[model samples]
Target: HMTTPFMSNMTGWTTVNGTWADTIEGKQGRSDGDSFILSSASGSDFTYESDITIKDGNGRGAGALMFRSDKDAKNGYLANVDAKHDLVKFFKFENGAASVIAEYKTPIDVNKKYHLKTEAEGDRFKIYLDDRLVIDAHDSVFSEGQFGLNVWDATAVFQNVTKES
Candidate 1:
């Protein structure tokens, strides 16, 4: 289960990329014409759950629940839905070295809302789509860091951000 939702962006976030806004709709975050919204929040092991939707375009772009990410996104764990590839992939990034830990081919429609969850504790990880476990795996490359939401070349609304410590 999750704790109370983190109602607001705590203090400061990296703003690694994108134009961001807060609306009645939700936290509208995105990358530039390129990709990425890396924040300043960091955590070891935790859970992040949100109601996510891609606007105006197919999510083929990709949205992610990120963990153990570095300042430059050169290293991290990305649990993402690749609409173009039609696959849900869990990946590890180290100094530009990236690989999928787990991947599942699933349908992801554009302009639709879905519940996405990532539970990461140490080397253990699990992902849920609409509350259904879709992928799980373990990796030790990234032992600990921070967790945040990231969008790539897509405009997304992230609502109901429930966090678990």
Candidate 2:
């Protein structure tokens, strides 16, 4: 497992709207924080697991596991948490446009720890939160790309990001 400090800047990461998107803990040394991106190398078939916690903070904030994503930051699949909506949504983003592939009500509350897992084989995808399957979708829009983490406009924390065959 790899670990790093959460940062609010989008310097090494890509952004869609604001110049600098997402915010973690203002001070370091705290596990409760957020990050803009946590990316992986390009590939086709893989499985990823992450343990996450979204801390309570001002503004709309959430966390997601991004897959088959573009380096340009404009396209890919996002299994995301919308704290404002209290839902988990799967999105297909291309050329700055977004389409919802699936969405489900979050079984747990915000600002709490959750286990997120995803499996991608070919065009099929599955998402699980806290070991509960939340999304199962098949789309060919993105056949091969990178994997990463996305923290929304609020503070969050992540640990144990691993990829397996």
Candidate 3:
């Protein structure tokens, strides 16, 4: 971690809407956030993590980490966690087809931040919530790609993002 804080600069990301801020508001909103993607760092084996918070407690809230993504809609893997619905979804997108590799239903606090992480090696992948190993699955369709963020209709915040290869 640097002495200076890490900010997304409202740029660098490839697909965020024109209305996006890199700051964490500690509250969730209705369509206050956009689907955002960042970085082109991808390989067969890697790990991605970030601290996430749901800004709005009473609405449909979503926050996610995208990996092995080509920075587009048709090909990649997404691990989206919903605070309002208490859901964790690990899915894949290919040829305009989407399928869930793993999913979990568990409660998560809407007013606090938690550590979100995902690891992919070969055809096996894992997702963790708050340091606990949650989901394990297999998929080999997307091997060549990068990592980023995917948020929609959420008042969510992301910080301390990292990628390990």
The numbered model that scores best in TM-score is: 1
lDDT per residue as tens, model 3, 1-165: 623244432224555342345443421223644455556566668888887776663255677787877756557888877876688889887764768888988986665788888888888888899899999998878886767776656767777777778
* Candidate 2 accuracy as lDDT: 0.65
Tens digit of lDDT per residue, candidate 2, span 25-132?
Answer: 321112123343535466678887666676676454667777777775468787866676788888877886778888888554566777788888898889888788
Instruction: Tell me the tens digit of each residue's lDDT in model 1 across 21-85.
Output: 66677777776343444556777788877777777653347677777788777788888765656
Alpha-carbon TM-score of each model against the true structure = 0.83, 0.75, 0.80
For all candidates, the clash counts are 5, 1, 4
lDDT of each: 0.72, 0.65, 0.69
Candidate 3 residue pairs in clash (backbone atoms < 3 Å): 27-55, 27-56, 28-55, 28-56
Model 1 gets an lDDT of: 0.72
A best-first ranking of the candidates according to their lDDT comes to 1, 3, 2
Error of 2 at 70 (Å): 1.1
RMSD of each: 4.5, 5.9, 4.0
Cα shift from native, residue 48, model 1 (Å): 1.6
- The clash tally of candidate 2 reads 1
Residue 108 Cα positional deviation in candidate 2, in Å, after optimal superposition: 4.4
Model 1, position 62: C-alpha lDDT score: 69
